Ligand binder design. Structure first.
Ligand SMILES: N#Cc1ccc(Nc2nc(N)cc(-n3cnc(CCO)c3)n2)cc1
Length: 273
């Protein structure tokens, strides 16, 4: 279970965007830290919409299991605030935000080595989850956070963390799942209860495509009906302009879930490049 944080110890500041049935804010948490020192800590406040409070269990189940495992590439959740009529997840504040936005704003200076390094880090996080048989369920660039930028001057690579998946696709309305094609894999469009470790391998491929496409959203030009037919006709995504990872993307986005490669094999493939 999560640590409970009092509403009185939280300050809400600027909106940082939205997720499915959620709103995201920068905030501050007043707390007693190590050695009894008082801190005012920057936090990320993720607020479930009041009109959708019936999703609260799924909303928190998302963060909870992951938070039971500690890992350098997994986002740190501090706790929850459920004072009053609020359902709030309190998470570490990451300096450079989510990867979808970062890729869009920085595509003109993100090269193949940056992408490869980010791909390796995401794959390491997914390998850790796979070895713990823990399904994420919503791997996408919007759920990757950039802790540290690349610094060629000190040879330092960028550093990312995988964030929580949000409300599960197993409880979400069908139209939202359809709009999430091609992150949601075909077997889960057919039946959301098919959610499996193999799900994350497909979504990881879609996420690599995002990383390689400067923040473009694959199939964004297709409405929901056409995204459905894309799966019915068994199409693959087009290779990104910088196509170094295209074979890996397509191997991960295998319409046969049992044929998708282990994250160990994915990592060995990345290391070959
Ligand atoms: N300009 C700007 C700027 C924006 C955001 C941050 N920091 C931050 N920290 C987090 N822990 C999570 C997020 N975040 C943002 N969008 C999502 C979507 C769901 O993943 C998550 N952003 C820092 C700078």
């Amino acid at each position: 279970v999560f640590h409970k944080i009092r509403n009185e110890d939280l300050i809400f500041n600027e909106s940082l965007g939205q997720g499915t049935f959620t709103k995201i804010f920068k905030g501050v948490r007043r707390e007693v830290g190590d050695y009894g020192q008082l801190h005012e800590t920057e936090v990320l406040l993720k607020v479930l919409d009041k009109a959708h409070r019936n999703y609260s269990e799924s909303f928190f189940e998302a963060a909870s299991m992951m938070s039971k495992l500690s890992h350098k590439h997994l986002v740190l959740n501090y706790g929850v605030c459920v004072c009053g009529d609020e359902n709030i997840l309190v998470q570490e504040f990451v300096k450079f935000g989510s990867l979808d936005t970062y890729l869009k704003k920085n595509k003109n200076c993100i090269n193949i080595l940056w992408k490869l390094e980010v791909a390796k880090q995401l794959a390491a996080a997914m390998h850790f989850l796979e070895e713990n048989t823990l399904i994420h369920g919503n791997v996408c660039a919007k759920n990757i956070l950039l802790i540290r930028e690349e610094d060629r001057k000190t040879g330092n690579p960028p550093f990312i963390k995988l964030s929580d998946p949000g409300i599960s696709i197993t409880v979400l309305p069908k139209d939202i799942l359809q709009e999430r094609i091609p992150w949601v894999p075909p077997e889960c469009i057919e039946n959301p209860k098919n959610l499996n470790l193999a799900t994350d391998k497909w979504s990881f491929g879609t996420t690599l495509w995002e990383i390689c496409s400067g923040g473009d959203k694959p199939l964004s030009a297709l409405d929901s009906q056409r995204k459905l037919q894309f799966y019915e006709d068994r199409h693959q995504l087009p290779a990104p302009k910088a196509a170094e990872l295209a074979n890996l993307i397509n191997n991960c986005m295998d319409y046969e879930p049992d044929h998708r490669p282990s994250f160990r094999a994915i990592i060995r493939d990345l290391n070959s490049l």
